[PDB]
Write a protein that binds this ligand. Structure first.
Ligand SMILES: CC(=O)N[C@H]1[C@H](Oc2ccc([N+](=O)[O-])cc2)O[C@H](CO)[C@@H](O[C@@H]2O[C@H](CO)[C@H](O)[C@H](OS(=O)(=O)O)[C@H]2O)[C@@H]1O
Length: 138
């Protein structure tokens, strides 16, 4: 098991055909989960399941440049459940990150940060027990 918040270095940045797999279990009464793909202080891709935003569950995705959040992309399909194990797979494609949860496609996020090889860390945080976090080339 891994300590949260957890930093996964991505040596040499991300590249198309890179697949990141995260296994964990959502804590009971969870509030939030966050994946943060970072380019230095910037957040290239923030993937943020929210379990109670005005009594709705929503996934918020965004980019942070020079400390400023951009336009949010919101997904109301919500595959996470308090107390239950999950698998997140993030596949880097030429034009987007492609996210599947529990083997089902969830969303795509078009690349706003264009220097993919400078996106050199993934931060994993929030109300989870983290079982594994790894990458492979497919
Ligand atoms: C419905 C909605 O849009 N809510 C956003 C709200 O928007 C409005 C705020 C005020 C007014 N007003 O006053 O009328 C109108 C809109 O602004 C918040 C601050 O930007 C957003 O929260 C941030 O969202 C980020 C991702 O985008 C990160 O997740 C971040 O968390 S962090 O720890 O990583 O750094 C988190 O704070 C909210 O999602």
């Amino acid at each position: 098991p891994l300590i949260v918040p957890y930093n996964l270095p991505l040596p040499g940045g991300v590249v198309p055909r890179m697949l990141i797999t995260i296994l964990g279990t959502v804590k009971p009464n969870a509030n939030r989960i966050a994946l943060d793909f970072q380019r230095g202080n910037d957040v290239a891709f923030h993937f943020n399941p929210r379990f109670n935003e005005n009594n709705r569950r929503v996934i918020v995705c965004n980019t942070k440049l020079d400390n400023n959040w951009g336009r949010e992309e919101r997904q109301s399909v919500f595959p996470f459940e308090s107390g239950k194990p999950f698998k997140i797979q993030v596949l880097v494609e030429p034009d987007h990150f492609k996210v599947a949860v529990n083997d089902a496609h969830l969303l795509q996020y078009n690349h706003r940060v264009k220097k993919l090889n400078e996106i050199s860390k993934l931060g994993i945080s929030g109300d989870i027990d983290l079982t594994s976090a790894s990458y492979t080339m497919i």
